Write a protein that binds this DNA or RNA. Structure first.
Lengths: 73, 76, 77, 73, 73, 76, 78, 73
DNA sequence: TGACACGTGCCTGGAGACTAGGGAGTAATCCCCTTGGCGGTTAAAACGCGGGGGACAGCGCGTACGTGCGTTTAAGCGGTGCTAGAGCTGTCTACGACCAATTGAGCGGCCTCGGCACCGG
DNA sequence: CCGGTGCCGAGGCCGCTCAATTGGTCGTAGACAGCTCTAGCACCGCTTAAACGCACGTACGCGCTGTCCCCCGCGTTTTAACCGCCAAGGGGATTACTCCCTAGTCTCCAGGCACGTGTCA
């Protein structure tokens, strides 16, 4: 398997249910996976940069909070 | 209350961290992984909600990928 | 790149809103200030129309509606 | 007349033409006027705060620039 | 005076000379000032975020280096 | 050796920092201000040489603001 | 706007040739989906480059794209 | 025939039409071909490196995606 | 060992190349006013000595605090085959609602002047 | 302790596009059906969250040290703002031109398929 494929179809369906959507096209799963990967890439890049700034080898919750703040609104 | 399974998302997050750190694998704290997973969940849920606002606007019940793409284009 | 809204009506409206926010106390508006404000309002309206027309072409329709602007605003935030 | 009505229908049509739209519903004008008013209100409020902060009676171009920065991205 | 005008016209002219330009329009100075301000805003925002991550009250050279890395190429 | 003066750029950087810190101003390490000024001047010089590449190709000899704007658009 | 503008077989041939050039005689199996993705990306990059080069051509008096209008765009972009 | 010549003039013209250009010089085709070749070289080099890293003999879609990611923005 | 890519063969419409027509954007030039570049000058903000004061970054160390792992399990969860039905999409239609165009004209923009409001050297 | 800059209101001219009315038409919401695809039921595998120990890398807080930030004076200093003359050129208009836009036709081929063959973790 590919590691991106571990986020299975029923997980995306459940997220979509929480988003209030009633019906789901077959291709959306693949597209959603790409979108999610992009988001994660950006956030994780910022988090890791913060980690390097802190002269640490462990990404902390604060690293993630700062990455999210500087990435999304 | 995590919708995505914890260990697959952990695997993916560590893969991307290895991508960006150029070989060095950072120890990921459990708090960091849960915060990141909750943020990704919330972002995907909001994107699905906006895409369904688009699809209902276009006289449909099934959201196609092209309206997720249009929502992403509008949001900037 | 010229203004498509005539300068005097927009100046009237801007001064009216400045009057509302200042309880009627008149804060004088410099010419460059009103010019920049009108430039920004014009650009904002043009971008909102390009987003509402993206909505319209997504719906298959050719004409904007009171719905495509409300939805562009709701999705933009 | 009302002062908001001085922004006539052909002006909104011309702005829409610059936005690339080929056809225009009759109600859009009214909605656009409301939207514009809201935008102006917000920007002008910030501008006036900047002016009052500087304790002056003249809204300068820099006041408007700061209002725009603090309002839109 | 306003603080952005302290970056005087001859300074922008000298920067332009280093850029190899032989003649300079009067409006370029104003435009350049705006551009520079935008750049500084972005860099300083990132630097200050890094400073807050380090739980420090003094912006260090490393904060600036990280801001520059994450901002420009 | 920098073209822009040290103190005007220092004051401007401090103002822009106050903008983003809700009024509290952090102490700026002089080396940090020097590095920031070096970076700003290098960015401005590169933008100017790109804009002159643009204006030389337009048949002109004098740099224009639209030249810088188009260079910024093309670069990113 | 989405449909591929370049014929698939000649572009796949060129992709295979450039692949051979780098490994110096090793023929790799090229998955058809990889060809489609590479062609999509190549066409998108070309279209964007023509867009920026036409932005440069609009700057000058001319309306027709030239070689230098693309060379300068590539130099400025990176 | 040469293999680069299989990308015919009308194909480059169609790509240019999609790029919004109205008129096309005769030499652009040759120059464009060179540019495209350079792009392909870079992307394919990265893709093949990924393929060798994956200990595979078949270039996959993921190899191309990774090459594109590491090559263009 | 089983799923996936490479070379032959047809053909049929789908597309590449040529030249007939041409005109319109591309190339070279003149000058007119605009508007940068340079000569003089002085002082007003810049910039290194120099005392001085110290808030705070940087480094060292202890401690427990959270990471990763060996191993289970089982049980909620995922992959899947089949199914009934609900929506997507292709198509007909017709009629309210838009776009172009001209005409009386009504408010903007330039021109100019009287009056005051006001932070400020 | 008064002053130069700028807005508000008014008198008044052009000008040019604003509103309305006409016609033309169009395109889109409703209706209708084939398709398709998909949410769910039911089976069987599966793999993941938590629990035991288990060792252990190291994050963080506390303390000590220096150390450069902030401050001002201050002598100097040197170059920015301003003004005026000199002259380089942006560009609008003019004239020539040449080569790339349509495009119908003769000719090459993309690929849909049908098949056979070799290949790799």
């Amino acid at each position: 398997r590919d590691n991106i494929q571990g986020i299975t179809k029923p997980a995306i369906r459940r997220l979509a249910r929480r988003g209030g959507v009633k019906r789901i096209s077959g291709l959306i799963y693949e597209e959603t996976r790409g979108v999610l990967k992009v988001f994660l890439e950006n956030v994780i890049r910022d988090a890791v940069t913060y980690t390097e700034h802190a002269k640490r080898k462990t990404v902390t919750a604060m690293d993630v909070v700062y990455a999210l703040k500087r990435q999304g609104r | 209350h995590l919708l995505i399974r914890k260990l697959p998302f952990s695997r993916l997050a560590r893969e991307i961290c290895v991508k960006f750190t150029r070989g060095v694998d950072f120890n990921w704290q459990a708090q960091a992984l849960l915060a990141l997973q909750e943020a990704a969940e919330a972002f995907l849920v909001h994107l699905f909600e906006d895409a369904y606002l688009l699809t209902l606007h276009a006289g449909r019940v099934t959201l196609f990928p092209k309206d997720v793409q249009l929502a992403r284009r509008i949001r900037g």
